[PDB]
């Protein structure tokens, strides 16, 4: 029971970390106005 | 930063032989009673000046506005 509770929390944490990392990287990625000016 | 030994004898049980989330619910009424009876004075000294000043401010603002109402 303890390890399964810990596992549920652990993949919650994994979800959170992936979210944060992708937010930062995609923010450093391209922009909507540039994509509009791509023609 | 030395450690002072005390010459005790300690028995401890493994974490996997105990209920882990029951002590939070065992004695809720007694714990609420203890919190209130131990901190009512501090609660009065915290929330007392705030509420008193707030009542005074709204009262004085009401008087001032009604007085200046032509």
């Amino acid at each position: 029971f303890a390890y399964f509770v810990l596992t549920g929390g652990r993949f919650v944490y994994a979800s959170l970390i992936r979210l944060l990392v992708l937010k930062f990287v995609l923010s450093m990625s391209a922009s909507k106005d540039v994509l509009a000016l791509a023609s | 930063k030395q450690i002072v030994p005390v010459k005790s004898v300690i028995y401890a049980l493994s974490p996997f032989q105990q209920k882990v989330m029951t002590g939070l619910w065992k004695d809720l009424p007694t714990k609420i009673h203890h919190k209130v009876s131990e901190n009512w004075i501090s609660a009065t000294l915290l929330l007392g000046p705030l509420v008193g000043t707030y009542a005074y401010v709204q009262n004085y603002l009401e008087k001032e506005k009604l007085h200046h109402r032509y």
């Binding site: 399964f4 993949f11 992936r18 | -």
Partner: protein, 59 residues
């Protein structure tokens, strides 16, 4: 018990445990996202962009 069964399955080597956690995070995030999307669509019926009566009548 089910806990002991799943323990004997995926809690004897750490690599599988990590892999299991990875599978769990992806699947659970997708499930929660689907549930929240269904809840949002149920709560905001009529207000969507796709169902406004004059979506293509200006032309």
């Amino acid at each position: 018990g089910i806990f002991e069964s799943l323990y004997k399955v995926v809690m004897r080597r750490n690599s599988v445990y990590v892999t299991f956690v990875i599978a769990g995070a992806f699947l659970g995030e997708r499930a929660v996202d689907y549930g929240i999307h269904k809840l949002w669509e149920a709560n905001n019926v009529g207000k969507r962009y796709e169902d406004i009566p004059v979506l293509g009548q200006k032309l």
